[PDB]
Amino acid sequence: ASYKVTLKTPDGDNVITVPDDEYILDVAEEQGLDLPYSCRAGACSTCAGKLVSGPAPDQSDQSFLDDDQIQAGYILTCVAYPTGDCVIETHKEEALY
Ligand code: FES
């Protein structure tokens, strides 16, 4: 299955198609977007984004955000799979400090 993921970047909004078994960061980069990252292993906050609408992405592979933050919609985009059409704001790391 695939989903329409709207990424709202500081530069502009981009609607891309992401399959249910690929990570959002991976697919965004394939489409020419430049999103932040460092570890790419779910263990830091560099790739953080925030869910604006749509179902929550599958974060079973993330570990850095606290249960509280997954709670509130923060997403580690490097290890997040989409689970429905959704809109995510990227570059949100500063927001977690
Ligand atoms: S780049 Fe470290 S958690 Fe995604």
Author numbering: 1 to 97
Copy the relevant paper text.
The plant-type [2Fe-2S] Fds function not only in photosynthesis, where they transfer electron from photosystem I to Fd-NADP+ reductase (FNR), but also in electron transfer to such Fd-dependent enzymes as sulfite reductase, nitrite reductase, and Fd-thioredoxin reductase (FTR).
Notable revision of the main-chain conformation occurred in the segment 67–71, where it adopts a short α-helix, commonly observed in other plant-type [2Fe-2S] Fds. Here, the orientations of α2 are different; the helix in the C molecule is tilted by about 11° from the helix in the B molecule. These results can be interpreted as indicating that the intrinsically flexible α2 segment is fixed in some molecules by crystal-packing force. In conclusion, the present analysis has revealed that in the plant-type Fds, the active center and its immediate environment are rigid and highly conserved, whereas the segments that encircle the active center are flexible.
